[PDB]
Amino acid sequence: ENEHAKAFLGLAKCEEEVDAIEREVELYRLNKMKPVYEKRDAYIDEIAEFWKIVLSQHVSFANYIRASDFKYIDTIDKIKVEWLALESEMYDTRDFSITFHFHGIEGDFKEQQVTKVFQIKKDGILTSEPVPIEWPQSYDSINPDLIKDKRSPEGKKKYRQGMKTIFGWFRWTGLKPGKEFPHGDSLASLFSEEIYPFCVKYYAEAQR
Amino acid sequence: HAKAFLGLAKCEEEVDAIEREVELYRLNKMKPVYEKRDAYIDEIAEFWKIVLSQHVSFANYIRASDFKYIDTIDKIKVEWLALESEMYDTRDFSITFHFHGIEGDFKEQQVTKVFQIKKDGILTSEPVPIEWPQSYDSINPDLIKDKRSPEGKKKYRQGMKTIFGWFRWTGLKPGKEFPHGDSLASLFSEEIYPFCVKYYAEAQR
């Protein structure tokens, strides 16, 4: 019992050392990868429908967003993730900004660049701040900033629809559970951990 | 397009080089930590027995009977071969089991199996001697007399599906060995050995 307690305490400390190691290793990886991502993304910028192809290829991504969203997701010409811990070691290694550029759709959806920023709070949860994005005209009836009667049976339905779109995700903060785009934090991690890092592999899978 | 694709292939190779350096960095830093960790683990009665029954998918690979023998594992040690030679893939490892045994049935014994990548790459291995339980004589490949006989083929296949059949696994004869012997190997090197303490804590929780 004292032998086991001694062992458990020893193991608790070993686990902290492992965490310390994982951070140091990830920081090193991030630094080494930065110039490689810069070169890679320059080649990607030359590829026609790269991101459209990549986002239709990811198995999980489609589950997070509305079917109607896909005509607008098809307009993404650039995705850029930047890891904040490269700016400051005070950041968690999971902290990042993501920049989208949409080419837009004539007469319906604005050509625009949008940057959303994700940071860990105290384990640890991703949080964000809302960022301006212009919603497409097709979505005017489900646009949160446009809906007139939010607490009227029809308006509640319309508010709920709008907030489950990819555009609702740009409002997500992670600070009001149950009131925001569902699983906004999981979607964020999908971009930082899967989509952005492995996009070229997804693009090749879509060809094969 | 062609320029872009060629550039991306060069970038992919740059990423591979970095991923190897990063994993070697991780593994070198982990070595002394694993050593101290495993020393504490040695002080804990049925640590591995608890861990192996706690893992989600481990149970799926082996015969139900085998758990009587897996329950006697009192030490698992993984060593990454790339730390010894640059010529090795970072996935290459040896795994050493100690079994406390069961009197009259299963000998106390230490067994080491080695896994190496051959060309992405597939995990391969060599057979390593392990003394099978006496209770498993009828399904022991080295003891089955008439293998090319409906009854013998069935006994043979039974034995090949035990954890003891896994010690014979090579990855060189598909359809003829312990099913998914390579996925089980990766379960040890990637999940069970690195995260055993998390599993043990989950079981106590």
PDB file of C-alpha atoms in Angstrom, chain B residues 46-162:
ATOM      1  CA  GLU B  46      -0.901  -6.840 -11.647  1.00  0.00           C
ATOM      2  CA  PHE B  47      -0.167  -3.646 -13.565  1.00  0.00           C
ATOM      3  CA  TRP B  48       0.023  -5.252 -17.025  1.00  0.00           C
ATOM      4  CA  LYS B  49      -2.865  -7.645 -16.371  1.00  0.00           C
ATOM      5  CA  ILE B  50      -5.033  -4.607 -15.542  1.00  0.00           C
ATOM      6  CA  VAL B  51      -3.734  -2.589 -18.509  1.00  0.00           C
ATOM      7  CA  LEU B  52      -4.226  -5.371 -21.088  1.00  0.00           C
ATOM      8  CA  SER B  53      -7.832  -6.058 -19.985  1.00  0.00           C
ATOM      9  CA  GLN B  54      -8.513  -2.289 -20.046  1.00  0.00           C
ATOM     10  CA  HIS B  55      -7.382  -1.606 -23.628  1.00  0.00           C
ATOM     11  CA  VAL B  56     -10.395  -1.381 -25.978  1.00  0.00           C
ATOM     12  CA  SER B  57      -9.345  -3.551 -28.912  1.00  0.00           C
ATOM     13  CA  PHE B  58      -6.588  -5.836 -27.542  1.00  0.00           C
ATOM     14  CA  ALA B  59      -9.187  -8.435 -26.461  1.00  0.00           C
ATOM     15  CA  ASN B  60     -10.411  -8.626 -30.085  1.00  0.00           C
ATOM     16  CA  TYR B  61      -7.153 -10.132 -31.389  1.00  0.00           C
ATOM     17  CA  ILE B  62      -6.804 -13.214 -29.206  1.00  0.00           C
ATOM     18  CA  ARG B  63      -8.568 -16.417 -28.112  1.00  0.00           C
ATOM     19  CA  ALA B  64     -10.693 -15.991 -24.944  1.00  0.00           C
ATOM     20  CA  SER B  65      -8.720 -18.804 -23.214  1.00  0.00           C
ATOM     21  CA  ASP B  66      -5.473 -16.852 -23.788  1.00  0.00           C
ATOM     22  CA  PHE B  67      -6.373 -14.351 -21.071  1.00  0.00           C
ATOM     23  CA  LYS B  68      -5.420 -16.877 -18.378  1.00  0.00           C
ATOM     24  CA  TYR B  69      -1.865 -16.613 -19.758  1.00  0.00           C
ATOM     25  CA  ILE B  70      -1.849 -12.914 -20.624  1.00  0.00           C
ATOM     26  CA  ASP B  71      -2.915 -12.315 -16.984  1.00  0.00           C
ATOM     27  CA  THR B  72       0.538 -13.616 -15.975  1.00  0.00           C
ATOM     28  CA  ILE B  73       2.476 -10.900 -17.871  1.00  0.00           C
ATOM     29  CA  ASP B  74       4.377  -8.976 -15.206  1.00  0.00           C
ATOM     30  CA  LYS B  75       6.694  -7.027 -17.535  1.00  0.00           C
ATOM     31  CA  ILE B  76       6.513  -5.484 -21.009  1.00  0.00           C
ATOM     32  CA  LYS B  77       9.511  -3.589 -22.391  1.00  0.00           C
ATOM     33  CA  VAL B  78       9.598  -1.893 -25.819  1.00  0.00           C
ATOM     34  CA  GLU B  79      12.872  -0.729 -27.351  1.00  0.00           C
ATOM     35  CA  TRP B  80      13.048   1.370 -30.488  1.00  0.00           C
ATOM     36  CA  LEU B  81      15.705   0.028 -32.850  1.00  0.00           C
ATOM     37  CA  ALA B  82      16.391   3.409 -34.549  1.00  0.00           C
ATOM     38  CA  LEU B  83      18.000   4.589 -31.281  1.00  0.00           C
ATOM     39  CA  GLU B  84      20.645   1.886 -31.791  1.00  0.00           C
ATOM     40  CA  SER B  85      21.174   2.305 -35.564  1.00  0.00           C
ATOM     41  CA  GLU B  86      20.299   5.014 -38.116  1.00  0.00           C
ATOM     42  CA  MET B  87      19.565   2.235 -40.631  1.00  0.00           C
ATOM     43  CA  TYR B  88      16.303   1.365 -38.850  1.00  0.00           C
ATOM     44  CA  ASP B  89      12.852   2.848 -39.503  1.00  0.00           C
ATOM     45  CA  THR B  90      11.521   4.812 -36.480  1.00  0.00           C
ATOM     46  CA  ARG B  91       8.673   2.245 -36.301  1.00  0.00           C
ATOM     47  CA  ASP B  92      11.115  -0.657 -35.838  1.00  0.00           C
ATOM     48  CA  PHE B  93      11.072  -2.088 -32.319  1.00  0.00           C
ATOM     49  CA  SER B  94      11.712  -5.092 -30.106  1.00  0.00           C
ATOM     50  CA  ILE B  95       9.195  -6.051 -27.448  1.00  0.00           C
ATOM     51  CA  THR B  96      10.138  -8.158 -24.429  1.00  0.00           C
ATOM     52  CA  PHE B  97       7.469  -9.935 -22.349  1.00  0.00           C
ATOM     53  CA  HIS B  98       7.968 -11.628 -19.028  1.00  0.00           C
ATOM     54  CA  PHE B  99       5.348 -14.228 -18.026  1.00  0.00           C
ATOM     55  CA  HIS B 100       5.131 -15.342 -14.393  1.00  0.00           C
ATOM     56  CA  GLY B 101       3.518 -18.573 -15.640  1.00  0.00           C
ATOM     57  CA  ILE B 102       0.976 -21.010 -14.179  1.00  0.00           C
ATOM     58  CA  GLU B 103       2.237 -24.072 -12.231  1.00  0.00           C
ATOM     59  CA  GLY B 104       1.887 -27.304 -14.172  1.00  0.00           C
ATOM     60  CA  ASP B 105       0.577 -25.498 -17.257  1.00  0.00           C
ATOM     61  CA  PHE B 106       2.581 -22.475 -18.394  1.00  0.00           C
ATOM     62  CA  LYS B 107       6.294 -21.948 -17.821  1.00  0.00           C
ATOM     63  CA  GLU B 108       7.747 -18.778 -16.285  1.00  0.00           C
ATOM     64  CA  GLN B 109       9.618 -17.230 -19.218  1.00  0.00           C
ATOM     65  CA  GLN B 110      10.915 -14.109 -20.919  1.00  0.00           C
ATOM     66  CA  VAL B 111      10.378 -13.726 -24.672  1.00  0.00           C
ATOM     67  CA  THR B 112      11.541 -10.976 -27.079  1.00  0.00           C
ATOM     68  CA  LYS B 113      10.011 -10.389 -30.524  1.00  0.00           C
ATOM     69  CA  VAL B 114      11.438  -7.981 -33.101  1.00  0.00           C
ATOM     70  CA  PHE B 115       9.450  -6.001 -35.658  1.00  0.00           C
ATOM     71  CA  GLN B 116      11.034  -4.316 -38.656  1.00  0.00           C
ATOM     72  CA  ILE B 117       9.607  -2.384 -41.601  1.00  0.00           C
ATOM     73  CA  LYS B 118      10.034  -3.701 -45.145  1.00  0.00           C
ATOM     74  CA  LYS B 119       8.819  -1.867 -48.251  1.00  0.00           C
ATOM     75  CA  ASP B 120       5.127   3.232 -47.151  1.00  0.00           C
ATOM     76  CA  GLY B 121       6.260  -0.069 -45.613  1.00  0.00           C
ATOM     77  CA  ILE B 122       4.857  -3.129 -43.867  1.00  0.00           C
ATOM     78  CA  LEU B 123       5.802  -4.477 -40.460  1.00  0.00           C
ATOM     79  CA  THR B 124       7.536  -7.847 -40.551  1.00  0.00           C
ATOM     80  CA  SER B 125       8.946 -10.163 -37.928  1.00  0.00           C
ATOM     81  CA  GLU B 126      10.754 -13.446 -37.279  1.00  0.00           C
ATOM     82  CA  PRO B 127       9.386 -16.386 -35.268  1.00  0.00           C
ATOM     83  CA  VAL B 128      10.622 -16.498 -31.678  1.00  0.00           C
ATOM     84  CA  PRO B 129      10.507 -19.561 -29.405  1.00  0.00           C
ATOM     85  CA  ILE B 130       7.859 -19.492 -26.676  1.00  0.00           C
ATOM     86  CA  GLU B 131       6.877 -22.460 -24.521  1.00  0.00           C
ATOM     87  CA  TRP B 132       3.168 -23.041 -25.145  1.00  0.00           C
ATOM     88  CA  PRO B 133       0.768 -24.009 -22.301  1.00  0.00           C
ATOM     89  CA  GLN B 134       0.588 -27.791 -21.783  1.00  0.00           C
ATOM     90  CA  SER B 135      -3.198 -27.387 -22.000  1.00  0.00           C
ATOM     91  CA  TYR B 136      -2.715 -26.197 -25.634  1.00  0.00           C
ATOM     92  CA  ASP B 137      -0.911 -29.383 -26.839  1.00  0.00           C
ATOM     93  CA  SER B 138      -3.649 -30.463 -29.301  1.00  0.00           C
ATOM     94  CA  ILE B 139      -3.541 -27.055 -31.061  1.00  0.00           C
ATOM     95  CA  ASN B 140       0.276 -26.588 -30.815  1.00  0.00           C
ATOM     96  CA  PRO B 141       1.612 -26.427 -34.445  1.00  0.00           C
ATOM     97  CA  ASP B 142       4.832 -28.219 -33.449  1.00  0.00           C
ATOM     98  CA  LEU B 143       2.843 -31.122 -31.928  1.00  0.00           C
ATOM     99  CA  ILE B 144      -0.016 -31.580 -34.414  1.00  0.00           C
ATOM    100  CA  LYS B 145       0.725 -34.868 -36.196  1.00  0.00           C
ATOM    101  CA  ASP B 146      -1.751 -34.939 -39.106  1.00  0.00           C
ATOM    102  CA  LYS B 147      -2.038 -31.349 -40.382  1.00  0.00           C
ATOM    103  CA  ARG B 148      -3.441 -32.163 -43.851  1.00  0.00           C
ATOM    104  CA  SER B 149      -6.512 -33.852 -42.365  1.00  0.00           C
ATOM    105  CA  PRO B 150      -9.863 -32.090 -41.773  1.00  0.00           C
ATOM    106  CA  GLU B 151      -9.394 -32.462 -37.976  1.00  0.00           C
ATOM    107  CA  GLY B 152      -5.700 -31.457 -37.955  1.00  0.00           C
ATOM    108  CA  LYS B 153      -6.251 -28.380 -40.155  1.00  0.00           C
ATOM    109  CA  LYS B 154      -8.877 -27.177 -37.666  1.00  0.00           C
ATOM    110  CA  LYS B 155      -6.580 -27.700 -34.667  1.00  0.00           C
ATOM    111  CA  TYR B 156      -3.745 -26.032 -36.585  1.00  0.00           C
ATOM    112  CA  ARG B 157      -5.864 -22.957 -37.364  1.00  0.00           C
ATOM    113  CA  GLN B 158      -7.030 -22.775 -33.727  1.00  0.00           C
ATOM    114  CA  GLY B 159      -3.431 -22.621 -32.515  1.00  0.00           C
ATOM    115  CA  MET B 160      -2.454 -20.061 -35.143  1.00  0.00           C
ATOM    116  CA  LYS B 161      -5.165 -17.766 -33.746  1.00  0.00           C
ATOM    117  CA  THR B 162      -3.806 -17.812 -30.148  1.00  0.00           C
TER     118      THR B 162
END
